[PDB]
Design an enzyme around this catalytic site. Structure first.
Site, short mmCIF file in Angstrom:
data_model
loop_
_atom_site.label_atom_id
_atom_site.label_comp_id
_atom_site.label_asym_id
_atom_site.label_seq_id
_atom_site.Cartn_x
_atom_site.Cartn_y
_atom_site.Cartn_z
N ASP A 82 -8.30 6.97 1.65
CA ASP A 82 -7.18 7.59 2.33
C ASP A 82 -6.52 8.62 1.42
OD1 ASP A 82 -6.29 5.13 0.74
OD2 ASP A 82 -4.31 5.90 1.37
N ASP A 83 -5.95 9.65 2.03
CA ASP A 83 -5.07 10.63 1.36
C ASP A 83 -5.75 11.48 0.30
OD1 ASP A 83 -3.32 9.12 3.00
OD2 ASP A 83 -1.69 9.20 1.50
N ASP A 95 8.30 4.79 2.91
CA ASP A 95 8.12 5.69 1.78
C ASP A 95 8.23 7.15 2.13
OD1 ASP A 95 5.71 5.88 3.13
OD2 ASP A 95 4.42 5.14 1.50
N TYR A 128 -8.76 7.84 8.83
CA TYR A 128 -8.34 6.45 9.05
C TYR A 128 -7.53 6.22 10.34
CZ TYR A 128 -4.05 8.11 6.78
OH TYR A 128 -2.91 8.81 6.47
N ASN A 182 1.77 -2.66 6.05
CA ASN A 182 2.29 -1.90 4.89
C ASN A 182 3.82 -1.64 5.07
OD1 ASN A 182 2.03 -0.27 2.52
ND2 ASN A 182 1.93 1.61 3.73
N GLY A 237 0.78 -1.25 0.00
CA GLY A 237 0.00 0.00 0.00
C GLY A 237 0.80 1.28 0.00
C1 LIG Z 1 -3.61 4.39 5.25
C2 LIG Z 1 -2.30 4.98 4.86
O1 LIG Z 1 -1.31 4.83 5.55
N1 LIG Z 1 -2.24 5.65 3.71
C3 LIG Z 1 -1.02 6.17 3.13
C4 LIG Z 1 -0.38 7.23 3.96
N2 LIG Z 1 -0.89 8.44 4.20
C5 LIG Z 1 -0.02 9.14 4.91
C6 LIG Z 1 -0.22 10.53 5.39
O2 LIG Z 1 -1.35 10.81 5.70
N3 LIG Z 1 0.85 11.33 5.45
C7 LIG Z 1 0.96 12.56 6.04
C8 LIG Z 1 -0.09 13.27 6.63
C9 LIG Z 1 0.13 14.52 7.22
C10 LIG Z 1 1.41 15.08 7.23
C11 LIG Z 1 2.47 14.38 6.65
C12 LIG Z 1 2.24 13.13 6.06
C13 LIG Z 1 1.08 8.33 5.12
N4 LIG Z 1 0.83 7.16 4.52
C14 LIG Z 1 1.67 5.94 4.43
C15 LIG Z 1 3.09 6.25 4.89
O3 LIG Z 1 3.60 7.30 4.06
C16 LIG Z 1 1.51 5.43 2.97
O4 LIG Z 1 2.40 4.31 2.73
C17 LIG Z 1 0.01 5.07 2.73
O5 LIG Z 1 -0.25 4.75 1.36
#
Ligand SMILES: CC(=O)N[C@H]1c2[nH]c(C(=O)Nc3ccccc3)c[n+]2[C@H](CO)[C@@H](O)[C@@H]1O
Ligand SMILES: CC(=O)N[C@H]1c2[nH]c(C(=O)Nc3ccccc3)c[n+]2[C@H](CO)[C@@H](O)[C@@H]1O
Lengths: 447, 451
Positions: free
Chosen positions: B116-117, B227, B161, B255, B9
């Protein structure tokens, strides 16, 4: 007769056979002419230099070598026995000769022995036979050269391969004096310039070393090499080498970024440099800035190539709509430019951030109106870095994307945080651990 | 019935089909049971989610899906339309249905929708139809679930999430209240814990969220994800999740690191955790790490005459990778909020040696004898990091080497410099290559921020 092209001479994951074939194709298109096979961690090149190639490995090298001839690129096989060869043992010399005969069976006519990145301490047996470390290297090198029938092009890379490695200096080094006097005249010598990663290679540094080794050298150029720093990529133009060098050199082989697809500019601009003054007379018609724009304008066309719904007025627009632009790649190169220099926009973002941070406490009409619009102007530029990332993220040529992804993600992460800091100055998850353990040790050293 | 395994993921270069087949093989060996296909930048998963797979792509997915069934691993296809789907357009809902029935033609029984995201701002058309962003998501999700014949396994990843993304908090979020009331009972819900990268997932945080979404969730665990930071790798053990969680969860899908071969420990230790209380004295992270590394060690001597004399230079490759080498490597690249014992300890000794440096030149026996041997002891440990690197560099399994090379090179470079600084502090009545620019431009901006 000038050797100009690429050496695959870096540490880490070597290029694969598909990529090397593609390199020969690009070298030919740009009128370069040479490739030097020397990947530090392709196991049979250095670590296991005694081991012969298996039948599977042999077939792949044959195909690679035929591919080189097909694209009119000279293929030079290099080998690196320096770490554990006993120079005075005939068994050892024979094992070397076998390895190199095996490769000439594959179609290879051009060779090299490399003694970069080893220490000077010989074993006891070698001390008795040879009166110095150079005497030992020049012995097996001249012998191998003769055994192979004195091939047209044979390279030797010295241990003291640049200005700052020559003990006690270049013009008085006992190691180099020995190499110049005793190494046979028809063997060419590799050299990286005044330092390992030379910012500039002055004509006068080449005249100097050319005297003590008694030939014009071939340059192993580490200008765009990035094996030494995880976070770095170099997309800036070939720079700091005068076109005057060309009639004083035997060649230039650039050792570029590990990530294959990021070397479009590095190789393209080297070719523009070589082609500008191809055969002179023993002060530049080459402009690095102009060369960079040629290269990026050509590279741009690769991004839309693999390697309906059109939304309404009220509807959410296609996230993929906008393609990568020339201005996007111009920005990316300035951010990941050269070892000793950032590109204009990068330098400029850093200067504005340094100013904004230092004059923060202001937050007086004169100084506020200045700080507010300077800060808004900086948010807009940080915006351009996100936009670059997003458009790269959607491009059809996923091969290129993947080679750069981690660098483009890093710079847009940092700019996105830097934007937050400047927004936070206007308003009065893992990050403490950033860079991991290595990061923590680095913060405790004089930077 | 518990879903435990790996979600692919992450952002960046996805895994290639050979590697995913190998993953299924490892999952089976360790008695894990699930894989969730969700690579952020595999173009047809998210960016170009509307585009159908080509004939070539279709063959590869079919083979992958058959491989999953062959190794008794549940294959879950996920898709991420959130960035640009218009939820209220039937054309758009249809395009989604087409994409998902194409994949069920490939043999896939289990599915997932991920939101997500993405941001919460809907377009104008969607605002009129649906009274909130959750109402829109739960609408297409329940519809797709029904259209596919209510599959045994269907996952939904919310936009909110985790704990820190819930506005204004988890127990009073209008987004989550809507998801719990209206999302159909037989759909499972993904959750990453109190934060995106949760150091700990307390039992009481799960009881809390389990009330508002009205099921036990399935955890998308980002503990070993890398990542988000170029320089980071995570080889430490699964940690910070009580075995008590298991009867309160529907599953755990980790993940893990982008670099395929570095996830031997991450997945191995998750399996040991699951297997310890399948139906908190039972799971020790430290013990689990040693089980994992002892097994991993055997992969390093496997591809994926001359014996030198008395006077001659010995074989540089003679010595193979050892268990102590990998124990050291894992402590250096351990977990997001914690270094391993040896790493923490090297840092503590360096911090001390630097701060008490002035002791070298001042008449003081007590403090010198201490600083001299402490420093020698630190040189020895820095020695062990070089030794680790060089033995990795010679290992027969080049596939693993290449996945880690840039991380192992980085840490041995820095330790080698750090050793030089400590040697230089010990020569202090006694007075080059790219380093001022270290980390590049990004490094310079990072140095100007409160760390
Ligand atoms: C459910 C989830 O983790 N979604 C993604 C995800 N989303 C986020 C963020 O939400 N990142 C974030 C939010 C706010 C400020 C900085 C980074 C991180 N990740 C993981 C780690 O980078 C990534 O591998 C993943 O695809
Ligand atoms: C001739 C040459 O550049 N040899 C190797 C080489 N050797 C070195 C050094 O030896 N650098 C060095 C040694 C001691 C202290 C600092 C830097 C750098 N490089 C290049 C850039 O990393 C690398 O790609 C290359 O394989």
């Amino acid at each position: 007769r000038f050797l100009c092209g690429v050496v695959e001479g870096f540490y880490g994951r070597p290029w694969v056979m598909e990529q090397r074939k593609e390199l020969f194709r690009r070298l030919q298109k740009w009128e370069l002419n040479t490739y030097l096979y020397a990947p530090k961690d392709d196991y049979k090149h250095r670590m296991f230099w005694r081991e012969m190639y298996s039948v599977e490995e042999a077939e792949q090298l044959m195909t690679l070598i035929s591919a080189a001839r097909e694209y009119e690129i000279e293929f030079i096989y290099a080998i690196s026995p320096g770490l554990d060869i006993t120079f005075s043992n005939p068994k050892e010399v024979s094992t070397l000769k076998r390895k190199l005969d095996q490769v000439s069976q594959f179609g290879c006519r051009s060779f090299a022995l490399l003694f970069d990145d080893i220490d000077h301490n010989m074993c006891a047996a070698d001390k008795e036979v040879f009166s110095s470390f150079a005497h030992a290297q020049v012995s097996i090198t001249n012998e191998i050269y003769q055994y192979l029938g004195e091939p047209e092009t044979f390279l030797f890379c010295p241990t003291e391969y640049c200005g700052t490695f020559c003990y006690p200096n270049v013009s008085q080094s006992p190691y180099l004096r020995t190499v110049g006097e005793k190494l046979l005249p028809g063997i060419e010598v590799l050299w990286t310039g005044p330092k390992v990663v030379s910012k500039e290679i002055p004509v006068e540094s080449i005249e100097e070393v050319s005297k003590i080794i008694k030939r014009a050298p071939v340059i192993w150029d580490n200008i765009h090499a990035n094996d030494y720093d995880q976070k770095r990529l170099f997309l800036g133009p070939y720079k700091g080498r005068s076109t005057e060098l060309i009639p004083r050199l035997k060649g230039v082989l650039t050792n570029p970024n590990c990530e294959f697809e990021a070397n479009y500019v590095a190789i393209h601009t080297l070719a523009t440099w070589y082609k500008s003054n191809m055969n002179g007379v023993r002060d530049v018609l080459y402009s690095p800035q102009m060369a960079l724009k040629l290269a990026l304008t050509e590279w741009l066309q690769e991004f839309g190539v693999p390697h309906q719904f059109v939304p309404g007025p009220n509807e959410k627009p296609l996230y993929t709509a906008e393609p990568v632009t020339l201005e996007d790649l111009q920005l990316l190169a300035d951010l990941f430019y050269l070892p000793y220099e950032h590109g204009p926009k990068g330098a400029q973002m850093l200067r504005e951030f340094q100013w904004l941070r230092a004059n923060s406490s202001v937050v007086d009409s004169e100084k506020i109106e200045e700080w507010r619009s300077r800060a808004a102007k900086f948010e807009e530029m940080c915006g351009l870095v996100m936009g670059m990332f997003t458009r790269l993220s959607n491009c059809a040529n996923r091969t290129i994307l993947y080679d750069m992804y981690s660098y483009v993600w890093d710079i847009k992460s940092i700019m996105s945080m830097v934007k937050s800091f400047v927004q936070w100055l206007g308003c009065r998850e893992p990050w403490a651990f950033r860079g991991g353990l290595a990061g923590e040790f680095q913060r405790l050293l004089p930077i």
